[PDB]
Amino acid sequence: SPMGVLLRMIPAVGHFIPITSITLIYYRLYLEDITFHLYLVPNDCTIRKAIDEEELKFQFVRINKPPPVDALYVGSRYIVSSSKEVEILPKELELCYRSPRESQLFSEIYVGNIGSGINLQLTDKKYMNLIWEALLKPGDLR
Amino acid sequence: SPMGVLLRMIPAVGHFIPITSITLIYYRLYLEDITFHLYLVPNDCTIRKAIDEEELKFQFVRINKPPPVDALYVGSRYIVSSSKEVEILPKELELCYRSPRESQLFSEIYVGNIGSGINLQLTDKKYMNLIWEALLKPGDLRPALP
Amino acid sequence: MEPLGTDDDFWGPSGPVSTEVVDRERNLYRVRLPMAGSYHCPSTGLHFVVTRAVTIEIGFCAWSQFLHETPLQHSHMVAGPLFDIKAEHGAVTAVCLPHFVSLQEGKVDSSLFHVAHFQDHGMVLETPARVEPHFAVLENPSF
Amino acid sequence: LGTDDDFWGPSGPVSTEVVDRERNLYRVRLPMAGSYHCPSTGLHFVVTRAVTIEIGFCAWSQFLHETPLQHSHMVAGPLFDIKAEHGAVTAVCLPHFVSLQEGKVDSSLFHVAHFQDHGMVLETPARVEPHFAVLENPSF
């Protein structure tokens, strides 16, 4: 019947434990301008599937880039930023588990024309160290 | 038709704005010992209604206490505490909006003996100032239907 | 025996008016306001200003199945509960929709509130006639 | 019906078939005994013979609530509805996203939840690995 893995919480720790996270990048090219949706979610194929389907309804398609290499803590907060001058809403993402049936939090990044490529970054809000980046270039669109 | 209030977000601030929160307290007595469920949620009758419906499935009863006085910020975090002999799971609550269809997070407080009463506290985790307080005493435990 | 009015009743010029429960599983309610006047329900936060007796039907809704239909919805956050309200075309002069945003700080710009109304052709975002500390005012609503 | 959703098996890759795209119901025909790994879902199956396994994606919210019993358990991995003939499956490896590389998570605190007709069963895994938990001889 349905089955999957649960973890017993400890009073000291609660929901905010260290997990394998994945970044999911989606783009839509419309006219000359490109918009990115950036998600940061637990490594959970059912979550990734529900986001893929929701984004496809709006004609956004996923670009594969490696995820953050370090374990991240549930509830930690990250700042979204870029090398190019861009409009980012919201600038801040929180890593949390939301059911595949609920909408997922993402950051929208309106770039304009891609030019040579754009460098997207996630930085730990607390102490400002880089935890993840990706270089998105015209060839990555395909 | 369906209608409600939306707020346009600004890029610098995002979802993490100040709201009027409410604390919701539920209890179940089993002999001497008692479990409390403490919720910290936006002031929204549909969320309050969903929580009340789920709690009554397990014979938990709401205790009315005044809500926090000051506006709290979405995404901010609060430490639940009390006296030495109470087990609290989890100690941290994060204020956020979750749809009335989603499960709502609460802190579970178990005390082996209520005695004269339990003082429950919520403290801002960033600067450790107390923001909300309740004294839960035997007189507050009223039978199941209000 | 019972008290004369509760938090779940609408309180108007003729004292409390009792809310009927239509379906308590699906959270549907109805109320008959007896006469012209301003009425308010403490439990929900709704206010109605009417010019004559009118029956109002009120259902509790979730934003989920409405708030993921256009990309421009992503820049708006839920600020209050979603209500499905139906009433005879003429009678309701104004509806007050509760919201849970704090304006005491001054850190929230009044102009950024909108009343979302989900018609069959999609969402309309209407400028409230007024935003008060705990509700937004929509005049002459067409439910 | 896609290279991303293949299982890795002893005789090469075996393709997952979509049974209901809108309900996320899938199916794989494992061609022989041995160990199979689907990198796309994180699922592994160890089987004793050729067998058809079907796999549906689920949400915990339908099944796991904030009840006095379930409140102390956190979602640690995806929820799958798996159906396979009894006696064909030596083991299933259910993925989880908890990081164990740091000595911060006690392995005895992992359980496999199994939501049957009469309520939640909580299964101690045969073993817990960095990215999955093993359930031996599952009765799906």
Author numbering:
A (entry chain B): 188 to 329
B (entry chain D): 188 to 333
C (entry chain C): 45 to 187
D (entry chain A): 48 to 187
What did the published study say regarding this structure?
A crystal structure of the rNLRP1 FIIND of rNLRP1 shows that the purified protein is autocleaved at the predicted position between F968 and S969. This is further confirmed by SDS–PAGE analysis of the crystals. The structure of rNLRP1 FIIND resembles that of the autoinhibited netrin receptor UNC5b. Inter-domain interaction between ZU5 and UPA largely involves the first β-strand (β13) of UPA, which forms two anti-β sheets with ZU5; this explains how the ZU5 domain can block the release of the active UPA–CARD fragment. The catalytically essential FS motif20 is conserved in NLRP1 homologues and in CARD8. Collectively, these data suggest that H942 of rNLRP1 is a catalytic residue.
Nucleotide-binding domain, leucine-rich repeat receptors (NLRs) mediate innate immunity by forming inflammasomes. Here we present structural and biochemical evidence that full-length rat NLRP1 (rNLRP1) and rat DPP9 (rDPP9) form a 2:1 complex that contains an autoinhibited rNLRP1 molecule and an active UPA–CARD fragment of rNLRP1.
